[PDB]
Ligand binder design. Structure first.
Ligand SMILES: CC[C@H](C)[C@H](N)C(=O)O
Ligand SMILES: CC[C@H](C)[C@H](N)C(=O)O
Ligand SMILES: [Ca+2]
Ligand SMILES: [Ca+2]
Ligand SMILES: [Ca+2]
Ligand SMILES: [Ca+2]
Length: 316
């Protein structure tokens, strides 16, 4: 909407106070004009019609329980925008400052969040498996990264290309979590998953097998569930990315770690310059090797570490 840029204040899903960019015109709206062509957050009102209504508030104060998922979806979209712009010189998900739209309160007790090809959508969770999913910065950044993938590599959401798609979202979700630097880790969803169980998460990149996901190509799922295992076989790529960044010895294969920033550069270049809609794991390995070669040189430690990591997870 047309109005003047304002700064509201509120509380997120985890009870933390933060400032949020709003727009004033009769009401204060969750419309941040400071980033690109805007970040807009909508109320789906427990229904599944999207996007719902642009979030309107009478006083620019967002401390009600009902406001919390909207506060975090809006704020963490801004953090994700900043990561892509500041770290990768990418202006929004399309590279041309497309408006970023998110809807919260989607459906009733909905235990998921997703990018739908046009916008981000967050369930509130059922209070047992999840609390409102926008409370996790890694979740928000994971889902917005699907939009980046849509506009670049276009990895088909099935089988190995789909597992790469998922892993790319887990990788950048985690790198955004480190960028914001609040309790960062290599786990996925830990801030909003199972409020009654401490210390767990939905997936682990450092040890995917902790939650039953494969950490080696020889353990890949080949069935048809989960679009051919896109959230299962992502563990193989998540483990390779973790090893590239942090190093370690995995199934007897040693990997020299090169750090998160270089991991992000290598995988962002692979995603935007080399991967295609049908890329498989072997082609991802070649894309990452070429990306590291472009950035650091063929004789670099970075190239050698990429090769070691894919070796360690059984991807040739
Ligand atoms: C419960 C949802 C899981 C974690 C995954 N995002 C799929 O969909
Ligand atoms: C990043 C976690 C969320 C729920 C995702 N759609 C699954 O996995
Ligand atoms: Ca208010
Ligand atoms: Ca964390
Ligand atoms: Ca995390
Ligand atoms: Ca938990």
């Amino acid at each position: 909407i047309t109005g003047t840029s304002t700064v509201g204040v509120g509380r997120g899903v985890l009870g933390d106070q933060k400032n949020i960019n709003t727009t004033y015109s009769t009401y204060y709206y969750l419309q941040d004009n400071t980033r690109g062509n805007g970040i807009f957050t909508y109320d789906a009102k427990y229904r599944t019609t999207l996007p719902g209504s642009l979030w309107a508030d009478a006083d620019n104060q967002f401390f009600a329980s009902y406001d919390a998922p909207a506060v975090d979806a809006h704020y963490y979209a801004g953090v994700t925008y900043d990561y892509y712009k500041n770290v990768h010189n990418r202006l929004s998900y399309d590279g041309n400052n497309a408006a970023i739209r998110s809807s919260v309160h989607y459906s009733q007790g909905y235990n998921n969040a997703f990018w739908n090809g046009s916008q981000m959508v967050y369930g509130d969770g059922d209070g047992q498996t999840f609390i409102p999913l926008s409370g996790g910065i890694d979740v928000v950044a994971h889902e917005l990264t699907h939009a980046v993938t849509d506009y670049t590599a276009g990895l088909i959401y099935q089988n190995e290309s789909g597992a790469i798609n998922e892993a790319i979202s887990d990788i950048f979700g985690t790198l955004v979590e480190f960028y914001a630097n609040k309790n960062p880790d290599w786990e996925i969803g830990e801030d909003v998953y199972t409020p009654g169980i401490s210390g767990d998460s939905l997936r682990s990149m450092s040890d995917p097998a902790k939650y039953g996901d494969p950490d080696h190509y020889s353990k890949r799922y080949t069935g048809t569930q989960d679009n051919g295992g896109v959230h299962i076989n992502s563990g193989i790529i998540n483990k390779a990315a973790y090893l590239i960044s942090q190093g370690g010895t995995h199934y007897g294969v040693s990997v020299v770690g090169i750090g998160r920033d270089k991991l992000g550069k290598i995988f962002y270049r692979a995603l935007t310059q080399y991967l295609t809609p049908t890329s498989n794991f072997s082609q991802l390995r070649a894309a990452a090797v070429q990306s590291a070669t472009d950035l650091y040189g063929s004789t670099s430690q970075e190239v050698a570490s990429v090769k070691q990591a894919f070796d360690a997870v059984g991807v040739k």
